[PDB]
Subunit: 346 residues, 5 copies
């Protein structure tokens, strides 16, 4: 007997199957087990506060109206053009801004009905999901992107979602990201919605993302640090070399300015202060203060033996004080952002 | 009895229901109560003068042709594929440039009919809504984005929209924006359209948005201020140090130029003057004038005791005058844009 | 009697109405009166030579097959799902590169049939319309965007479009543009197409757009002018100060270069010369020539009393000649682009 | 008699017309005459190697099954909703990456059947067509964009395309391009495909595009040339002026660097060398070599009368040699790229 | 007899053909032979880790239910509107993020059925396929883009894909890429998926892409190398020329900074270190160290004959040591990235 005629009898008008009535309509809620396989993961954008995934979504439930014994085969397959003939959960992604199915060559959908009446429903789909990002502590930030699977119009006494016990979320191997590192550890949560209509089932997965630091260190932090060190070389230059020390001071300020202005195009465009901005501002205040130190020495020197000794003391004190206070700033900045502000992801 | 056959009888050919005829066709207008829940909020663009939202829109009205008593259950649910079998208000968003429904997994729509005949109709949808922005007073600007809910072809003697009394507009928690801060206080308004055809119902919500200032202060205002202070250090340098004072003056002008040119890529692209532009222009005029002050001192000095004293007086006067006039400018700029130009949002 | 059954009788099979046959099929052409209401206006792009509008388009004509007397009501409304049951003009936008209807909540369309048989057909739609831009005279340019309403397959002995006498094109209040100013005065034209098939009706509207100049003046023209003035301060510096005058000259050239290079990212990307480019090139030639003037003075001075006097004369002549020739250039540039090249918009 | 019933009889079930069977199914191939009218032309992108057009495409052929004599009128018009009732050629654009029809207001399609049976089929459509670009010789490059009209599944013994004799490709007046100039001369070609299945008809049009040079000359070539000339002014400065000549040399190198770095954002992003890159590299080697010339003079001078004379000879030789070798480079560069590399477009 | 009626009989209700039942339903798996012809290839993006292709995909299999002998012709053609009447493999692209068919003018699809029952099915389609990129070793990187052809719901005992023996993947001539060079050698692989459901057929093609280096060499590597050489010219300048050597040192550091900052906008935006970044960092450390060498010489010199000789020895040692250590760095960098890190593509 052909499997298509058996499906016509099983879900036909003589069977009285109604795709608008959930299984076990009188009694206990439908339990739906969910798996997710992530094929790709990227397009993490701060301007729109979202990211993009391409996933396989598998749902399994039981429909006792679909149990069959007559047919020899253990499973039946429904055509992806007639999926509207069967009841399916009204799952939706609660933080989704845009999404689409896939249809090139045949429909990228699959549905199997087993003898006991269990239904397996696997689809492939692309999502744009919202994630709020902080971006304070920016070079050394860690973000948490979530994915929520909610029911649209069924309360928790009608429909319940559950994560599969063995392996609910899997990620394909070899994936890479231009900016982040997707950690291996993933959170499976329960975020049941309490509204006025009632309790609505919602399960959730959290992914942890750590930004890489090698580019920011090698292109922004170390060049700024070398410019700051270069500003300290004014203190070892002869006191009477005004064109040398003044030109070195102001050119160091200009170099500091071009370094920050060129860095500005690569950084995320936000309106609040980030850790990198704190670093750039302090390095600018350091090269600004090294030029004010020479302005003080140059003015105190010309007042016409005591004045020359007093001017030379500001130089020898500045030779130790400026590196020391920059060391203390370094210690504080790195501990605050690598240890204090750094917190458990959970 | 199955709920789908009861819906077939209630809105069937034997019932004579007509989805093109509004409820209470002879008499009083249909009153529609609206709620909005904002899931996400962002993509605020000045180049297109618009922003993007993802919302739940709930409408409630009464249809006395849909009242039922026979059925045991208190509510009935209509399938989202047969929504064209029921009358619905012809709501539209009057400032919408682009919009779309959501359809991944099942249709993201819901409709419930109660025994009294009340209809609840909840849909989920994405909008791109226009908002004119001013962007004068730019770092310290405040914008007001609106959302208008109008009827398309019904006059106010046929269809009236009302905001729900308890909570018409709600925003989900945890939302963030790269540039703005969405205030908690929201305006519910009435913007009834008066045309030649008649009065058309239109209700409106206003959201208030305040730009954050920390980045603009730490990266644009303070570095410009330090460059201006650095231009004043020419006045404490010996009068006969022409290569030092001239090179410091012109390098300060170049640093000022690179600071503004690098800042130009991050700012909004508009053709009129913004407050930041006023600040950048005055700081450029200050470093330009400090170099002209040395050109005057250098020319007045060489005229061959009176000429040297006269040249030294321009220096000692400039040491107090330049910071003072920059202080007065600062006071005026900050009061005009933080107090005077700042106005009540209503 | 229900209005939908009357519409079924009026445009039914017993009526013999044919939506493929124009009204007055044997005789005079159909006259269609058009209104346009512009809801939004923006996205004016030079890289694609186009702009974007969101409009209401209203068309009115007479169909004597649709005249009714039996029905009590003065007007009837057709459902936007059955618009293919009535004849409509085959209007299209002749300079349209992309366009779409609007469908969120109900269809954004409307059609009313009056007793005399007059039809009113109002739709809402988004357009991307092409406009060729010149962009010579760029800071001070004025553009004219048009909108053409043509018939696709009807000649002028079958279909004629007319602008409404009272108010054919209206613009909503409060619209703003980041770059331009939409003038209040609008042109209503006739651009009848003459082809080999015959005369085709086409009506047209022109909108006038004037670029704002405040940003370009405050950020590009005035800073360039101050750099040019700063290059003239070399002439008041002592002749024997070679490191001062040479370093001021070359740093002025570098400042001029960074000013133009930073300006280059904000300007439109075209391959021909614009007025701003003429200004930048002349200011570069001025700071280049001020450094060549010192190279001539420095070379003429060292030739070992006549040579020192001759070198001092080039300086005192240059102190008047360089500002004068820059004044003449300013006068010519501003009159040519503000008066001569500026022409009547019509 | 109504024209729609005559079309129902002519292409009806009683007529036996089959829209899947080409005209003259037993014998000679169908000859299809093609016209193209180009409404707009732009969006020429090197990052995707493509351009965008909006065209009218007219096809004419003969179908002897559609010949009619009974009807009084000379032509009949088919409704654009029933175009699937008639045989049409399976034309496609062989280098098309993306394309779409136009549908706002009515369908932008037209089909006329004459008494002899000739069919005229005119449609309006947007194309994104691929064109490989070279971009070597970049400021002075010339590109050739093609458009190929192929059959998809008919061999040359069934379907043949021909260009119309009188005017096959026309361009609307007033079109402009931000970067190129579309030449008036166009090539009509035959690019018949030879495959394993057989010969497939394919006709082709080539458009010639010449880049404009005014911006590149006024903003990149002339400023670089002035910087090179400014580097030669070191040779007329006194030999003992080490801070002047060294600072002028290195600031000229820095100015050269900022000029190239600012130019880099406007140029096309490719991985191979372009003519502009050759020019920028040689100008950098010239300002680099002028500073090495002073390093040689400064070192040869201090060796403690012969050494001072020998050092002065390198200066006077460099005053003539550096402009001469830059003139020879200019002559060679301009002849190679304007004459030698420049080739006939055919 | 018309070919369409024969197709109606062959795949009709009297024939009992079922498009949901694969050929040879009881026994051996269906063998599908695949060809790919690549029409275009580009849009290789690192921000989304993907590339774009436009291809012809040909599949051939055997369906013994479709064998015919009565008809005179050797082949039959199915209409692209009735492709759902025939069984087709459920191929899909396993690394596809987005894809679409082509439909302008007729459907870009083709299907032929031969007498033996062999089916040939050729379609044209656009793909966006994911490829993970490394981008370490960035100027000199080599990437491998793959394309996987998998079955969606058939195991390897039902459906097997095979590459055609003669020529499975062909590329059209004349294709170019702005950044890469598509090598001629291509890998045909077998990447059979082993899941819990069973073995799923999957065939794969790898394309090899080598980045071109001419732009990076002429615009980034050589200018950086000339700046490094210019920093060595401080060692041949007189020891007592503090304003010359200090200003040359710091201006060389500033030039190095502007060169890197201008280069930053063209490079790919990633968070890890690339080979170019290593080169830029070492060149910055070289110009930084040349200025520290003068700070050491200037400090050791003024201590008041032994001190002047000791200071002159650091200069003469640095004249050989700095070029030598830069040569060793060059040798190591170029061998590590051109030879060691360079590996066989397989
Ligand atoms: C879905 O899962 C829930 C949770 O296990 C089931 O609810 C339980 O049903 C058993 C019936 O044997 C009762 O004894 C328990 O008290 C129920 N627990 C709760 C918390 O309600 C439910 O039966 C399942 N649904 C179906 C259709 O089997
Ligand atoms: C919609 O709301 C309006 C406003 O309350 C209702 O109009 C009122 O109807 C009552 C009937 O009891 C009259 O007494 C009032 O005078 C009406 N007020 C106005 C301003 O017209 C209207 O009846 C409501 N519609 C329906 C269907 O109940
Ligand atoms: C559409 O408008 C045209 C222009 O007014 C009408 O053409 C005129 O018709 C009147 C009939 O009373 C003639 O007397 C005029 O000579 C016509 N003028 C021209 C220029 O042809 C036309 O009748 C209108 N169409 C309809 C259906 O009323
Ligand atoms: C399409 O055009 C071709 C080329 O002119 C026609 O082929 C010719 O047909 C005539 C019939 O009078 C023969 O005498 C020629 O020898 C043919 N030439 C070739 C090269 O085959 C063809 O008949 C045309 N198709 C139709 C339907 O008229
Ligand atoms: C598809 O190809 C496979 C591989 O050649 C075929 O499987 C073979 O079938 C022959 C039948 O003559 C057997 O003798 C071999 O032992 C089979 N090999 C394997 C590895 O199974 C298969 O028959 C082909 N399918 C069809 C429909 O012909
Ligand atoms: Zn897809
Ligand atoms: Zn969606
Ligand atoms: Zn819309
Ligand atoms: Zn269109
Ligand atoms: Zn296409």
């Amino acid at each position: 007997m052909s499997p298509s005629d058996f499906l016509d009898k099983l879900m036909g008008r003589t069977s009285g199957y109604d795709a608008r009535i959930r299984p076990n309509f009188k009694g206990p809620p439908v339990n739906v087990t969910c798996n997710i396989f992530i094929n790709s993961f990227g397009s993490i954008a701060e301007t729109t506060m979202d990211y993009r995934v391409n996933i396989f979504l598998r749902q399994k439930w039981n429909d006792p109206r679909l149990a069959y014994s007559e047919y020899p085969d253990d499973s039946l397959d429904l055509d992806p053009s007639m999926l509207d003939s069967i009841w399916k959960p009204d799952l939706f992604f609660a933080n989704e801004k845009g999404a689409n199915f896939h249809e090139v060559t045949t429909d990228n959908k699959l549905l199997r009905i087993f003898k006991n009446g269990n239904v397996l429903y696997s689809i492939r789909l692309t999502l744009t999901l919202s994630c709020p990002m902080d971006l304070k502590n920016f070079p050394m930030d860690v973000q948490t992107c979530i994915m929520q699977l909610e029911s649209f119009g069924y309360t928790m006494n009608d429909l319940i979602f559950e994560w599969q016990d063995e392996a609910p979320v899997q990620v394909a191997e070899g994936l890479t990201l231009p900016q982040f590192l997707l950690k291996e550890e993933k959170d499976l949560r329960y975020c049941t919605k309490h509204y006025n209509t009632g309790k609505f089932t919602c399960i959730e997965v959290r992914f942890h993302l750590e930004r890489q630091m090698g580019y920011y260190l090698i292109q922004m932090y170390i060049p700024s640090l070398l410019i700051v060190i270069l500003s300290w070389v004014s203190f070892w230059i002869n006191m009477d070399a005004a064109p040398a020390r003044v030109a070195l001071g102001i050119t160091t300020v200009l170099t500091m300015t071009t370094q920050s202005s060129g860095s500005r195009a690569s950084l995320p465009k936000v309106s609040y202060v980030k850790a990198i901005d704190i670093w750039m501002a302090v390095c600018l205040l350091f090269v600004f203060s090294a030029l004010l130190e020479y302005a003080a020495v140059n003015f105190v020197s010309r007042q016409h033996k005591v004045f020359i000794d007093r001017a030379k003391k500001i130089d020898t004190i500045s030779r130790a004080c400026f590196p020391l206070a920059f060391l203390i700033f370094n210690i504080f900045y790195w501990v605050i952002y690598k240890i204090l502000r750094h917190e458990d992801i959970h």
